[PDB]
């Protein structure tokens, strides 16, 4: 998208979201990142929304195909097609990870931007881990863990316990523990401690911030209800 203005790419990403054209949205936001400037809060959210929709569709398709393939193992077409979708999913994760490494993370000096990008890095390694098989899985899992852990360390030092990015990071890291790392007790402990520390800080918030934080706290509670 090298010939399109940065501001036009951002405007088109917003239009693509309204039109539910998420592949287009991701391509516009990739072009905007590649202009080389840092992203604002709103622009970071557009980048994340675009890719979460693209990879979310791929993950849902991969799960459907994997389920059919496993039942078939109780011609080569189901495996071949699951592999095709898997390769496409891995390519999207690699693209996002490449944008974070060149050069979003290294230029992110404020806590809000750096935590946001490291949470993304953990998420896309987690999506790689969902489809990885073997010892490849081990290094991919450690990459997710390391990204989430660095984000957590910054978030606990630099953000209040009600900050929505801090809360969403803790939510997703708890899902990592439960679903990827086979550490359900660590998942439950993280979700509980996060919820309780946020509850105790709600009194400091405006009505609008209260709504933002409690929405994500309910997600932590929903997981705790499922896990206990």
């Amino acid at each position: 998208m090298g010939s399109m203005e940065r501001a036009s790419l951002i405007q088109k990403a917003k239009l693509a979201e309204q039109a539910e054209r998420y592949e287009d949205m991701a391509a516009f936001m990739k072009g905007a990142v590649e202009k080389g400037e840092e992203l604002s809060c709103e622009e970071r959210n557009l980048l994340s929304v675009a890719y979460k929709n693209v990879v979310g569709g791929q993950r849902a398709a991969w799960r459907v195909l994997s389920s059919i393939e496993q039942k078939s193992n109780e011609g080569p077409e189901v495996r071949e097609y699951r592999e095709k979708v898997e390769t496409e999913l891995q390519g999207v994760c690699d693209t996002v990870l490449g944008l974070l490494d060149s050069h979003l993370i290294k230029e992110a000096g404020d806590a809000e931007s750096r935590v946001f990008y490291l949470k993304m890095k953990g998420d896309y390694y987690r999506y790689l881990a969902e489809v990885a098989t073997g010892d490849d899985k081990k290094r991919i899992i450690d990459s997710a863990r390391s990204a989430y852990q660095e984000a957590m360390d910054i978030s606990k030092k630099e953000m209040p316990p009600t900050n929505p990015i801090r809360l969403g990071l803790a939510l997703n890291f708890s899902v990592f523990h439960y679903e990827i790392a086979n550490s359900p007790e660590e998942a439950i402990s993280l979700a509980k401690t996060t919820f309780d520390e946020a509850m105790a800080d709600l009194h400091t918030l405006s009505e609008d911030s209260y709504k933002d934080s409690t929405l994500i706290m309910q997600l932590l509670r929903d997981n705790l209800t499922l896990w206990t």
Binding site: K14, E17, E42, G56, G168, L171, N172, V175, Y178, N223
Partner: peptide, 9 residues
């Protein structure tokens, strides 16, 4: 188990 939906700006 649910992560942040993250699919709407």
């Amino acid at each position: 188990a649910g992560s942040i939906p993250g699919r709407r700006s």
